[PDB]
Symmetry: C2
Subunit: 114 residues, 2 copies
């Protein structure tokens, strides 16, 4: 439940004395760390742990978002609506009925990029 | 927030590039965005930070998407594991009055044992 997680993150901005002391840098490293926990769990086909680390990973990315807002005034809805513009623009086939071949998709993508 | 998960779902459905990506490859894509974030922070480049923050949430969520695709992992249960974990480790987030760093850590230290 994503909302529950964003509420959590809101409560941490407002209340948490550990979070107050963390820089985006530090959080960035926390995130690179969970990425490693995820890679290890995939390696072991450890499904219960994979599920744990996926959650850890999303939380930690979202804590980087939070402090980007805290410290740099980055709005997450803006940051999100932006990446959605980019994707939609680059990969227009996402909104097209018939699937298209990898080669078709790339030729498009090569051109969108620029 | 939601248009982004619809986007991701559309990629699971349609995208011939995403079919060819493994969670390892994608973990690595997230690691690289994290670098781009660290960089826009360095340079107090606000427009770019907003960019990369977005890139990072999307890519993180694409790692989640392939965890589901390839390993069966349900994002709602994964988020729920992490909501329970934090609620257990940081009970102060649901307490009215604030608490000190020193207080929060003593607690966290013990809750970590469970
Ligand atoms: Mg972590
Ligand atoms: Mg973890
Ligand atoms: Mg990327
Ligand atoms: Mg980027």
């Amino acid at each position: 439940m994503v909302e529950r997680l964003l509420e959590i993150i809101e409560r941490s901005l407002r209340k948490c004395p550990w979070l107050e002391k963390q820089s985006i840098e530090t959080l960035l490293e926390a995130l690179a760390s969970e990425i490693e926990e995820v890679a290890e769990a995939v390696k072991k086909n450890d499904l219960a742990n994979l599920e744990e680390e996926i959650g850890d990973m999303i939380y930690d990315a979202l804590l980087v978002a939070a402090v980007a807002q805290r410290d740099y005034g980055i709005d997450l809805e803006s940051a999100i609506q932006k990446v959605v513009e980019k994707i939609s623009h680059r990969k227009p086939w996402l909104f097209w009925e018939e699937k298209i071949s990898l080669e078709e998709a790339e030729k498009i993508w090569k051109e969108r990029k620029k």
